[PDB]
């Protein structure tokens, strides 16, 4: 038996189980990165790399070579935020300071960083731990979360310290 | 195929003619596309063999002018070497032609 | 060969259902869609038949 | 180039084999026409060794025909 | 414009290099009502072997394919009403999304000091992060003959 | 392998919202494993026995038929073998998108007149600007 | 990047690259064709030009002709465009004169 | 994504748009052909590249027939842009039984074929004889004793 | 007439170029996550 | 396929349940209601050539007719053929309505 | 009675499945140095 | 779609004639009256210009 | 088969050394098992959430707690080996940070540009 | 091997000149247009015995030099085309082709 | 390298007797290419390994391609244009090799190269900035299309008849010379 389909205007209703937005609203400790890639990611990547669509795309050789601007700038003008935890070397002579490393660096990369940018040439070993970014809530109750980091305990040869004048 | 398609083959005068007359979406069969590729390759090969036979005829009519009297074996072998022909293979095909003539008669 | 604005016979629907049962072999299961397809199998103790699927979502 | 080179190589081999087959078919047709002219005209024969080899090859071909028949 | 037929240039690509010699041997004076003016050899630069080589042409076509793919894909519309629909939030949503104690602290500090403030101490994202969902090359279309009395410039009604 | 079920935990709460993301789409044409198009550039050609390589036949290059392609953008093949690439030509002339995503152009008279619907190629036709229309009408004095 | 891209385009136009390390063959070596430029006073059909300029010794449908390209010079094209604009202005002006003096006669 | 889109089919005119792609050999459903290049070309440029005789030759109409597909009407004049189904239609109609008789087709013989059981000639060399369809298809054609009479 | 709606944030240079649009967006997102001018937070949920 | 969804009168519409039938045209230049309007398709009480030429334009359009042409040569096109007139174009006399 | 296409693979097998169960450089001539 | 008296649309002495206006009010202020005249002229001009653009 | 090596599926070591999602540099020649296709999303999410249970009786990639983020893993730099701990196959991946020296006028440059005391605990600093 | 045979019996300059003076020349690119199928040895050797090589649009290509000529439509077409080529060559060597071409030229000039 | 101004090669057409061709290099205008050519013509392989040395190395130093023009071939020859040869890793005409490494480069030398006279020797390269061991002797009259692509590092002072003799070798369908044109011995005349 058919329905009275001549009484409804041709508009599509909403499905009964309404889908949740793809945006992840959970900011806890088990936050999951979404493996699914969307069109907007590629669009923004092209527009950031070679000014799509106002500029013609560079040839495949330049795009896949080390001279492409992103890789060139990442090599010559590195952007790595290595910050020292003062609670380890402040008014205490310790042999293993603690650093906050971007989660993309490795132990050898951190050793090279400390050896070349600052000159720390006495590094025994590095122990790395991946920690979720520090989350908090402001006065209005909105959930904020800082960038993720990596705790790197760096063992040295000679104990170092920083003296705080009383 | 279908009965109308077989009638159309008989009308066109051959399965190959029917397949080659049908063009693209008119012949929506993948089997038809495969057999059309095969037929095109085989047609090109037949044309190649026709050109080959014409080349052979031209070579024969060019080298017959000197080998017509065949009075001297050395005189014959001079032309055979100038045109690049193996004497043993020539004798073998002469014998094959003789056997074929005996079979025909 | 004209219908005449006449309804279809019952044997037509019977044979259609028989053909559907015969061609019931293939499958349309998708990987990431099984997560939402499993909602028909209410396994959480918070699921209600008359209330719905409201209290089951954390 | 690594994709396209074998194709032109096969084409070159095809041209070489075409020339070889042209030579072979020309030799066969030359033998045919020579035999026809010899068995048609008069006082136009082959040299002694030529006739001997032709007779020997005819014997061999007839033996092969008898073998493939029996 | 039809009265000025003007001279037409016909470039004929002959199969052999004896071009214009066969033409001058023919030596036509008129064809219909055309009255051929002259016959010369079109001087052109010799094309390199790369134009006829299949490997070079395949490489160039591969490069053009990659360029056109990078330019055309993925396709995203320049603008649609859905962008401005989704990027709209209410005032309470804006305040809840972007808010820091900086505004209240600056209010207190300015009340206590007496200085002036010209720019907001905090950047306010009125889209609540929705503008990051709109592609970067977006721009609204030009609408002609809108239904509004605002462009008249009335100052007394 | 990996099965999907309800959850009732935070991982499932995240998955229920993350699996709703629309993955990037790209219309991939049907491959040609049997009839390789770029293999026919060596078909139906004469070769010079002096150097043993093909001859750049201008007539071949002129009468060649272009079969479109996504990674080589097109291939010139002899017109004799062009009948095996009739579906790739349709896929290339068609819009590189599911028709449902652009079907809003066949559901109103304006777009049904402004847009070309041929081989499922939703491409807008030529349209005069309003200034051009006014200019034409005023020059025609009507 | 812009500078290097224009340089590489200029390099590719000349065709100086070859996978087997070696210089490419000279350009005018494989051409084996020529182009004749004919100046006409009126438009002539391409088929007419082909049948009148074709080789009478070639047993092919093209008759030694690869292609025929008809073109208008840039000066003649600009002249045609300016004449079209002037003709539109003239039509509009005569219409306006007629419509303005229709009522005073 | 399509890096190269094939041009409109049979766009070999200077002033007039190409015929419908379905009439040229593409997909049906369109009762009019459109060429983006001809549309973008200004009117003065078309009038400059064309002449009055050429313009009229391109305007030449074949109503109500089609010049690219001979023997049938044009899809732009048919009610639907699809081809008419009165000429090329299935073999049997709806509700019609199959009662087609055994038809005998003409065939050109290539050799002097002599039936020994009946003691008579099938057909002489270069003779057009009417034979059975199945016989010609399965026995005469493979032996190359005869070919179809076309 | 505006080329972008009135509620869109201005992510562009002073001259109008969009060379650092993504960098400006990342800087704004980092500032929203943790502003440098943020005083003493009063909430009972502090990062440390 | 032995029984198509169009037999069982199954209402499959995009605006209704998001489904569409398998055997149908993606695009339809004219809906069934426009095809049934035979008055606007055939030549019924309706003019087909809207250009009304002057006396000199009528005579100029008759000069391009080849000598030896008769009106009885051009038949009336059938009903399923759209009644239209392209105006004074090349070979216009072949058009029955023009 | 004898409806293999209607019954599942656990109850019967079709004729198609029954039938398909059974179904599914350069060269240089070299002569050995042993002989002459 | 459907049948509508296009042969009457635009036949009145002014732009407001033969327009199905069912969104009005018994009292219109100065701004409301200005917008009413603006919308009548805009309806007429948009119809005419869109028809001309489509035809050309 | 799969594009990534088979030790990422089952490490060459008997303990299961070298199991997990490995991200590679775009310009690198090595290939990893981090793929975002609609067919690879299930196993990637499985490795991120459920982990991987080895037949030896241990979870190799994710035992529990905070899930790993394969999008921020440092780029893959080689392959395992039984003799040593790790073979660095791709060296260009590792960021060898190198900065210039005092050569030139580098002794006058400061982090800020010059435009034309006892600290006290405050609640807010504007600038 | 074939390479050894070719190095043993080369092609003479006279034969090569005759073959080049031949009016018609072959085109050798058709082997590249054969449909390619990834078929295993067991499957192909099973089809070869079960007579499935020429079924469902498939076929078996074997290179041939000589072909049976009786009712071969393409051979008859090539023969007629060669006859027309020879007639055209006779015309152009007698000079009537240039005569007809000049007649067309004079007609187009007078018209 | 003013001491080494000319080198020599002994070209053999298959089984024919070796014939000597003598070059003449211009080390002033292009030191890198001339130095590479001289070192390849010299080819000092006097490194003699012993039993214990081979045992501790496990790989003979001769297992890798040696930087010598000896036993090389002329893989690319086209009548009327030039003759190309000098491959180290094999005798087929690909995968160039140099003494500095894989391939060297010299833009200031490439920009000033001019090919206008026959018998001029240049470096056969795929790109203007990837030069190796493969060289070519120009046989044609003038090749002006090679100006900013290759580097002419000298000419031929004796052996033009040898060049014209090895140029007349027929080409086989494999795209290579029908007769193996090889270099049996190379050296330098200091
Ligand atoms: Mg767990």
UniProtKB/TrEMBL annotation, chain B:
It comes from the Eukaryota. This is 39S ribosomal protein L28, mitochondrial. It comes from Trypanosoma brucei brucei (strain 927/4 GUTat10.1). The chain holds residues 122 to 226 of 241 of the full protein.
TrEMBL record, chain D:
This is KOW domain-containing protein. The chain holds residues 271 to 340 of 378 of the full protein. It comes from the Eukaryota. Belongs to the universal ribosomal protein uL24 family. It comes from Trypanosoma brucei gambiense (strain MHOM/CI/86/DAL972).
From TrEMBL, chain G:
It comes from the Eukaryota. It is found in: Mitochondrion. Belongs to the universal ribosomal protein uL29 family. This is Large ribosomal subunit protein uL29m. It comes from Trypanosoma brucei brucei (strain 927/4 GUTat10.1). The lineage of its organism: Eukaryota, Discoba, Euglenozoa, Kinetoplastea, Metakinetoplastina. The chain holds residues 106 to 210 of 471 of the full protein.
Automatic annotation (TrEMBL), chain J:
Keywords: Nucleotide-binding. NAD(+) binds at residues 43, 49, 52. It comes from the Eukaryota. This is Uncharacterized protein. The chain holds residues 24 to 121 of 242 of the full protein.
